[PDB]
Specification:
four-stranded antiparallel beta sheet, 13 strands, alpha+beta, globular, homodimer, 8 helices
Chain lengths: 280, 273
């Protein structure tokens, strides 16, 4: 459905903003040069961008186990792979993340579409999919009704049936989905930044971008003064004193970034991001 | 998998909304083996209603048909094959009604919560099992005219071809225990209450009372109407008030009324074969 290089492009615009409770969201996107709208629905709340890291933790544990579309996953393994203090509220936060993933539906409508598809020579293609086709869950205490009257459960083991097409891709194109276990422990914007590079920096040794374009390729819907302000703060604390306000370096797990601020009439209007790929 | 062929009328039929109803949630009690279980039904839009059972089983036969004229979990379905198998004259409003049925099936999610027990793989000393599932894992759909933004501001589409990815476990079960899910092409054209009766028989299969069939089929409608409706739909399928037979496509029924103080208080149903 979703190609692995298109992931940061299309799927990330289909998720809700962080800490946001939505049941629906519509977004315009581009692949194949073609206009397409993607819809995200849930009977509960849709996946937010903060769930990408629990989702990619599930990816890692799936491929590891199978080294048969049934996969058992212990919530303590998710908490450690995500660098979470085994707690009560922390178990519950992972559970809410996996829940939002389970019940989120994505529907991709091609718009300048027009293909030979069958009898229809100029068709309109839509693809509705879900990451998990079925979840079996073992809890330690009894199902309880919540405040709203619907059942609440607290799993500690999960049995995952991934969507068939994605499941064989998750094992075939295995490289596009297995991330360093520490990248799964970062803030959302660093995770989003690293993921864009795994696509962009294929068949490239070095390359230079502007943070304004990283604002476009990563988070079109967030204004500059907070995309830049946010991504710099997280990039600076991953820099460990290696630089000043106007220059710092950071080793984004193989991608070596050099972040130079750009100044016009004394104020900071952009940032140069120089990338150098330590082939590992 | 979860809903076996013996459990179908028990678990799935109670989990759907009543007809003519638009719901986003519904909770229901079921019995697997005498152990308590709750089933939850959710949709972002409306949940599958019992009137959708026939469209769902129309999808079942066409799925099994395709792969016997040819296991690969990708299946194409033309809306006209569905429209005819359900005996609907190809129309506009009729092709849109099938589209809505398939829509409710797509987005309806089922969650089965076991309530007592049960037994232990290990560090779960009295575990509690829940199963969340959806009939279709993925749908690819081809329309002839363009997506429009609708009344709600969200996209409306008018498909004529559907490519179905069934849930993996159910897809092999739809081919393993294949005999159950394959129905007579005329059963898919009847009223809901008749279809529910025929489906119950393939699970139960004998002598039954219409009073208990009222519980096994539609616990939520009181006898006064369940019998009046079902005894009418059954009589329109026969030739010949207190005694009649009807050949429910393989199950031949003999329906004897029970009379007490001049009025009819129940019905005995003999069933062969």
């Amino acid at each position: 459905v979703v190609s692995p290089t298109n992931w940061a492009g299309i799927i990330d615009q289909a998720l809700a903003p962080p800490r946001t409770r939505k049941s629906y969201q519509k977004s315009m996107v581009s692949i194949s040069g073609t206009r397409a709208v993607i819809e995200t629905r849930s009977s509960k709340n849709i996946m937010t961008v903060d769930d990408l890291m629990t989702l990619f933790a599930l990816f890692t544990l799936t491929v590891q186990y199978h080294d048969p579309n049934k996969t058992p996953l212990y919530i303590t393994d998710i908490l450690s792979l995500r660098g979470k203090k085994d707690s009560g509220p922390a178990r519950d936060s992972i559970r809410d993340s996996i829940d939002r993933i389970e019940f989120t539906d994505f529907q991709l409508h091609e718009l300048t579409g027009r293909w030979l598809s069958e009898n229809m020579p100029e068709g309109f293609k839509s693809d509705r999919f879900r990451f998990l086709a079925r979840t079996i869950t073992a809890s330690e205490e009894a199902p309880v009704e919540g405040s709203d009257g619907e059942i609440r459960i607290k799993p500690n083991l999960y049995i995952l049936v991934w969507e068939p097409s994605f499941f064989e891709e998750l094992l075939t194109r295995d490289y596009f989905f297995l991330f360093p276990p520490e990248i799964l422990k970062q803030h959302t914007l660093v995770f989003q930044l690293y993921s864009y590079f795994r696509s962009r920096m294929s068949r490239r040794h070095t390359d230079v971008m502007m943070l304004s374009e990283l604002n476009q390729k990563l988070a079109r819907n967030i204004e500059w003064r907070r995309f830049s302000m946010d991504l710099i703060r997280e990039l600076r604390r991953l820099s460990e004193g290696k630089g000043s306000e106007d220059l710092f370096v950071v080793n984004l797990w193989g991608y070596h970034l050099t972040v130079k601020s750009i100044e016009e009439k004394g104020k900071v209007v952009d940032y140069q991001v120089d990338i150098k790929c330590d082939v590992e």
